[PDB]
């Protein structure tokens, strides 16, 4: 259970580096808050802009995380 609390923190940290909108998008697209993965369309309605906009945000966030900077600890969690 202690490698669970620890992990989330590390993830949250790298999430902080991302733009506010970006991180919110990610948290909602993976259910980090509610455990429930949400579609495009729920964020299309809940968020300001509609569908096909959240997909762009998701890719532009992941591309930021995929860099060797701002996310390399989690590589060992795999």
């Amino acid at each position: 259970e202690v490698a669970k609390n620890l992990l989330r923190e590390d993830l949250e940290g790298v999430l902080s580096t991302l733009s506010p909108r970006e991180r919110d998008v990610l948290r909602l697209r993976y259910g980090l808050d509610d455990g429930r993965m949400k579609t495009l369309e729920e964020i299309g309605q809940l968020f300001n802009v509609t569908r096909e906009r959240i997909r762009q945000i998701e890719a532009k966030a992941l591309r930021k995380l995929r860099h060797p900077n701002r996310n390399s600890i989690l590589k060992e969690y795999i």
Binding site: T17, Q45, Q56, K60, K64, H67, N69
Partner: protein, 232 residues
């Protein structure tokens, strides 16, 4: 969670219209046909917003608002009053009711939703300006009347500059927002992509008019106001 809205109105047709429009907007709607049930439901549910009619039977809407303000559990709940607006006396009594906002019936659904959004932002992007319109879905810019295809990074850079239109953005801020890199990483990449933007957007890239270089500070996107487009 979804924000909870309590709508209190004796017009079932208005009540239904409002409820439908709020649910379509993603809210949890509760409906009440009278001030007594409305007050009890407000106390029971602690809704995130109350929309309150004026002409409820047995108890006027003002007394309802005053009672919500007198109960510590409801004293802080925002109250958007729906009013038939016709007498300076109802105005004067609303001036004492503790209403947070007023909305005149008949109202536009968009105005109602704007007020709801502002109240919720209180409890808790530029895609077009002048001659520039961003098309995210195609990574394209409308530049005056010509369509310009952008690369992903060129588009994101232009968007980052548009978000801070008329202000100088530092290279470190561009690196952080577009690339997510450490502030100390090589800024030379930015210098390249700004040049492409100028090649695509300025009439003369050697004398750039809109994408200016502020030596020692960064880059600034200065766009003419819509009133000046005819001169450019």
């Amino acid at each position: 969670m979804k924000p909870r809205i309590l709508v209190i109105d004796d017009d079932s047709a208005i009540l239904e219209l409002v409820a439908v429009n709020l649910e379509m907007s993603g809210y949890d709607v509760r409906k009440a046909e009278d001030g007594i049930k409305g007050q009890a439901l407000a106390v029971q549910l602690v809704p995130d917003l109350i929309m309150l009619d004026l002409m409820l039977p047995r108890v006027d809407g003002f007394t309802v608002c005053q009672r919500l303000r007198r109960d510590e559990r409801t004293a802080e709940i925002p109250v958007l009053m729906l009013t038939a607006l016709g007498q300076t006396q109802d105005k004067v009594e609303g001036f004492n009711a503790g209403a947070d906002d007023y909305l005149t019936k008949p109202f536009e659904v968009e105005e109602m939703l704007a007020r709801v959004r502002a109240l919720l932002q209180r409890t808790d992007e530029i895609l077009s300006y002048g001659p520039l319109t961003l098309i995210p879905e195609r990574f394209e810019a409308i530049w005056f009347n010509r369509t310009v295809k952008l690369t992903h990074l060129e588009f994101e850079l232009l968007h980052c500059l548009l978000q801070r239109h008329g202000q100088t953005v530092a290279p470190s801020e561009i690196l952080k927002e577009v690339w997510g890199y450490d502030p100390d990483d090589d800024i030379e990449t930015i210098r390249v992509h700004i040049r492409h933007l100028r090649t695509k957007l300025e009439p003369d890239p050697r004398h750039p008019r809109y994408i200016k270089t502020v030596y020692g500070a960064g880059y600034c996107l200065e766009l003419p106001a819509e009133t000046e487009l005819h001169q450019h």
